[PDB]
């Protein structure tokens, strides 16, 4: 109860900024994000067994995939950190337990494919979630791991606090498919641009923590070049190994998965910058002001791959 997690001193500073890497040590991602519930939810909010517990069979239920893999749950928990530490005020007690969780488990069991790959394969789980095949998938995951002996983290709260959470959750894991975000950040923009956004009526918060879970999701266009750079590499190794499958089945890939094209890459990037990262970036900066710094290095990463395109690099 008394038992603090602490960092040193390089990652207890630089964990607080939204660019921060959570490094090469796999070892240390647990420690980083019970770091990260202590500060954002208490000491209080889980009872450590059981979080230590419940981390480590998530852990267990990512694959040893090039980018949909335990090092991008943590990623992305990070990144919500990041928005809710900078947010103190604007965010319920659920609402800091299950977000972090939510992010965690966000991909638990991807496989490195798109919802349109199991489509096209007539995989099983195509036929048990028509829509936001993996999305679901990764919500089932969530309660079946939750439901195990010794992982109900949420044990402690009333039976109408557990179902909220779980229903924040599901929402949350939902809206990580960018098929809906497009239409998710348009609603957004207009209401915002309206007047009529207000964060008491429940389903436009249901909007906002939908665009966060975007915002959070895509976080690795928002690091230090390097880590952007390097994180690219592996996106297209999964993309790739995907079009590598279409073909098999008979089906020419879109560009983006086909690995013929790896000389576009760089135009690539530009077109996702400008249709989803950017956009994301600049609506979320407008409902939660101190976001900023995610649209600004979002903005640096869009230059540097202006540089390359220009061949300065
Ligand atoms: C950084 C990043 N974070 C998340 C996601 C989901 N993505 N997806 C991408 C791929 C963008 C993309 N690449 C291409 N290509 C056409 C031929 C060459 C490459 N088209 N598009 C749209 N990058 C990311
Ligand atoms: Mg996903
Ligand atoms: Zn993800």
Redesign the pocket.
């Known amino acids: 109860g008394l038992m603090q997690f602490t960092l040193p001193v390089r990652l207890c500073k630089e964990i607080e900024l939204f660019h921060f890497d959570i490094g090469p040590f796999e070892n240390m991602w647990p420690g980083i994000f019970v770091y990260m519930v202590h500060r954002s939810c208490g000491t209080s909010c889980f009872e450590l067994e059981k979080l230590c517990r419940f981390i480590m069979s998530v852990k267990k239920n990512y694959r040893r995939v090039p980018y949909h893999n335990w090092k991008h749950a943590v990623t992305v928990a990070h990144c919500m950190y990041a928005i809710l530490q900078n947010n103190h005020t604007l965010f319920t007690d659920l609402e800091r337990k299950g977000l972090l969780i939510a992010c965690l488990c966000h991909d638990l069991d991807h496989r490195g494919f798109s919802n349109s790959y199991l489509q096209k394969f007539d995989h099983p789980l195509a036929a048990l979630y028509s829509t936001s095949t993996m999305e679901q998938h990764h919500f089932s995951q969530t309660v079946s791991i939750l439901q195990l002996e010794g992982h109900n983290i949420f044990s402690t709260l009333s039976s109408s606090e557990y179902e909220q959470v779980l229903e924040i959750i599901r929402k949350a894991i939902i809206a990580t498919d960018?098929a809906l975000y497009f239409g998710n950040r348009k609603q957004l923009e207009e209401m915002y641009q309206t007047g009529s956004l207000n964060l008491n009526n429940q389903s436009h918060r249901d909007r906002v923590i939908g665009l966060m879970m975007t915002a959070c999701?895509?976080c690795?266009?928002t690091k230090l070049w390097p880590v952007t750079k390097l994180?690219?590499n592996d996106?297209?190794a999964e993309?790739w190994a995907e079009g590598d499958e279409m073909k098999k089945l008979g089906i020419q890939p879109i560009?983006?998965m086909?690995r013929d094209?790896?000389d576009?890459?760089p135009?690539?990037?530009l077109?996702?910058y400008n249709?989803?990262?950017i956009p994301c970036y600049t609506t979320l900066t407008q409902i939660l002001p101190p976001t900023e710094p995610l649209l600004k290095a979002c903005r640096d990463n869009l230059s540097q791959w202006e540089k390359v395109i220009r061949g300065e690099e």
Request: glycine share 8%; hydrophobic share 50%.
């Open positions: 960018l999701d895509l690795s266009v994180t690219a996106i297209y993309f560009p983006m086909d094209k790896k576009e890459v135009q690539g990037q077109g996702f249709a989803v990262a």
